[PDB]
Amino acid sequence: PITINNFRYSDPVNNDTIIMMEPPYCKGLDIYYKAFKITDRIWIVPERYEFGTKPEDFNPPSSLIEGASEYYDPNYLRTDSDKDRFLQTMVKLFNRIKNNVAGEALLDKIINAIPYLGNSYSLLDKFDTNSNSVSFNLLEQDPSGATTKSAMLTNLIIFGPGPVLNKNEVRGIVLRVDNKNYFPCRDGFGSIMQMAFCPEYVPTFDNVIENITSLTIGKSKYFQDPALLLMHELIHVLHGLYGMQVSSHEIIPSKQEIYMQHTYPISAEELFTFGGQDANLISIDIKNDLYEKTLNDYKAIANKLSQVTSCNDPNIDIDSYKQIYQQKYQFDKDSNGQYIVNEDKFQILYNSIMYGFTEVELGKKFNIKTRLSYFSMNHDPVKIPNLLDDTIYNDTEGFNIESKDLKSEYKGQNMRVNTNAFRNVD
Ligand SMILES: [Zn+2]
Ligand SMILES: [Zn+2]
Numbered sequence: 520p521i522t523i524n525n526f527r528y529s530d531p532v533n534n535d536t537i538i539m540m541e542p543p544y545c546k547g548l549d550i551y552y553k554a555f556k557i558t559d560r561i562w563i564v565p566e567r568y569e570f571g572t573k574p575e576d577f578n579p580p581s582s583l584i585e586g587a588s589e590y591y592d593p594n595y596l597r598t599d600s601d602k603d604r605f606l607q608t609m610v611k612l613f614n615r616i617k618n619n620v621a622g623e624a625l626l627d628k629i630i631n632a633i634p635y636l637g638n639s640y641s642l643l644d645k646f647d648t649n650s651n652s653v654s655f656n657l658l659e660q661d662p663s664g665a666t667t668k669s670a671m672l673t674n675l676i677i678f679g680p681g682p683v684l685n686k687n688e689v690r691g692i693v694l695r696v697d698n699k700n701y702f703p704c705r706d707g708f709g710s711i712m713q714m715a716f717c718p719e720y721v722p723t724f725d726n727v728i729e730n731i732t733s734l735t736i737g738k739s740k741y742f743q744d745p746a747l748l749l750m751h752e753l754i755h756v757l758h759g760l761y762g763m764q765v766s767s768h769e770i771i772p773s774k775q776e777i778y779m780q781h782t783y784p785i786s787a788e789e790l791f792t793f794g795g796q797d798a799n800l801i802s803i804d805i806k807n808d809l810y811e812k813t814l815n816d817y818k819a820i821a822n823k824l825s826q827v828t829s830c831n832d833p834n835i836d837i838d839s840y841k842q843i844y845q846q847k848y849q850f851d852k853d854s855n856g857q858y859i860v861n862e863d864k865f866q867i868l869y870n871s872i873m874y875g876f877t878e879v880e881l882g883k884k885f886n887i888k889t890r891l892s893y894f895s896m897n898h899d900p901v902k903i904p905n906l907l908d909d910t911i912y913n914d915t916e917g918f919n920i921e922s923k924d925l926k927s928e929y930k931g932q933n934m935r936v937n938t939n940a941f942r943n944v945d
Pocket of ligand 1: 725728
């Protein structure tokens with residue numbers, strides 16, 4: 520049974536659920552941030568995502584274009600009080616996800632999808648834990664009273680937002696190989712996934728709409744549930760953990776029959792993640808290329824796994840990990856003892872990864888309102904200042920609380936009804 524840990528930002532490090540972590544991209548730089556283990560293989564670091572950015576990037580542009588979509592605030596998540604609040608909110612969102620069997624299943628899949636200890640450029644006959652793609656360093660406090668540096672394996676690390684507060688994103692660790700960028704999370708191996716997330720700002724939408732000509736209102740607005748935005752990102756995490764993150768890839772098969780707000784190029788990764796009819800916007804030709812590509816990555820991984828005879832880390836049980844990967848990749852064993860890909864089992868696994876968890880279906884399972892298609896206008900996003908108040912949002916129903924008669928018709932998400940639940944960004 521999955522357990523969601525509890526803690527306050529001010530609690531002291533304990534070498535277990537609370538630690539000082541040297542994030543993957545700070546490997547060897549000796550820069551640590553306080554981190555909290557929400558659950559096995561998942562860590563939360565209440566800090567702004569400043570990786571690969573500059574101090575000035577957090578400040579607004581040179582008098583922005585009239586596109587009130589990207590919001591900024593360099594002072595967000597900077598104090599201990601801000602971080603604790605952020606931490607309590609993430610714990611609540613995770614409990615909300617866990618309290619629904621469908622969310623629980625998502626978390627479970629993610630937790631068990633551990634990155635392979637190696638990649639296309641590591642020693643094929645040895646499990647490798649010495650890489651920021653699978654491990655991060657930390658400071659540990661030991662009985663003798665001395666502080667030492669150690670390493671740890673994980674699946675996901677969630678940071679606060681980057682420059683843009685309302686722009687949740689998920690990326691796998693990038694490796695530098697032969698002066699090129701290599702993503703193990705796209706090669707079947709998977710890797711630590713990182714998320715930049717902000718639970719306070721959510722987008723708005725209106726399904727009941729069809730060309731509001733000679734109009735200005737057409738009331739029917741709804742704000743999104745932060746838990747669904749989180750699960751949305753978690754789906755991206757799932758794809759990466761299995762090494763199936765879809766790289767830039769998406770043109771225009773048939774973009775017109777959709778009715779909501781627009782039509783413009785995007786990434787297949789987004790369409791798969793959103794699900795619903797949007798997934799059908801990816802041509803069968805492209806779906807077949809992706810499928811064949813991943814099948815090939817998995818066959819290469821089965822051949823590698825079959826070669827593993829040692830590991831650099833003495834704390835790793837070789838056979839135990841071999842069994843974990845056999846289960847993860849759904850490999851069979853021929854009479855020769857070699858690991859092989861079973862076509863039917865692969866297809867079932869592939870389907871569960873690309874189609875089994877989607878924003879549209881999860882919204883349905885959670886009684887959370889969603890938009891028709893991923894294709895929508897840059898509607899002004901709103902802010903949810905009180906997620907910690909059960910009278911506004913609880914971990915079993917979100918905003919759609921039956922005791923307040925806000926369950927029916929997702930009234931808890933209806934901007935004209937649950938007026939106090941949100942605030943317009945200034
Ligand atoms: Zn509209
Ligand atoms: Zn997405």
